[PDB]
Design a protein around this ligand. Sequence first.
Ligand SMILES: CSc1scc2c1-c1nc(SCC(=O)C(C)(C)C)ncc1CC2
Length: 148
Amino acid sequence: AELTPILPFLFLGNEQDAQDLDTMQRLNIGYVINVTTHLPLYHYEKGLFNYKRLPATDSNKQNLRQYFEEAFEFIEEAHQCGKGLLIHCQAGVSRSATIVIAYLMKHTRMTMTDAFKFVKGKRPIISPNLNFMGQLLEFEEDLNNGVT
Ligand SMILES: CSc1scc2c1-c1nc(SCC(=O)C(C)(C)C)ncc1CC2
């Protein structure tokens, strides 16, 4: 049950990783982003975590760029209060890895490929999907022609 730490307060996992409550609390995670339409918000009724759903499919037509800003705000909310945030989807982590990489590109000032190489080093099994990759490329330009 690996919850891959990407930053000290930002973790990435699949559907089975998000179900390990005892590891969540050990790592002081109080925020969860569920990047699926169909999975439950694990541990919702327990009243322990703040939740956000990005209702996205792992398809070639899914727009994830629309969710970047909303997701970055939830990450910084956890960061500013000293709590960890878990972002997960399913096996292959295609959706959640895209959002994690996008965050690193904006607030770590890495390039698209540098962020991808950084994440792959920590979670070696990332399933590819060219549609999300193209959205990250467009995202890189919007960054390079803006502030921070
Ligand atoms: C931003 S990805 C990137 S940049 C340069 C390369 C790649 C890459 N990525 C992947 S898997 C990750 C993905 O496709 C996501 C679902 C997170 C968008 N497989 C192969 C390659 C080839 C080289």
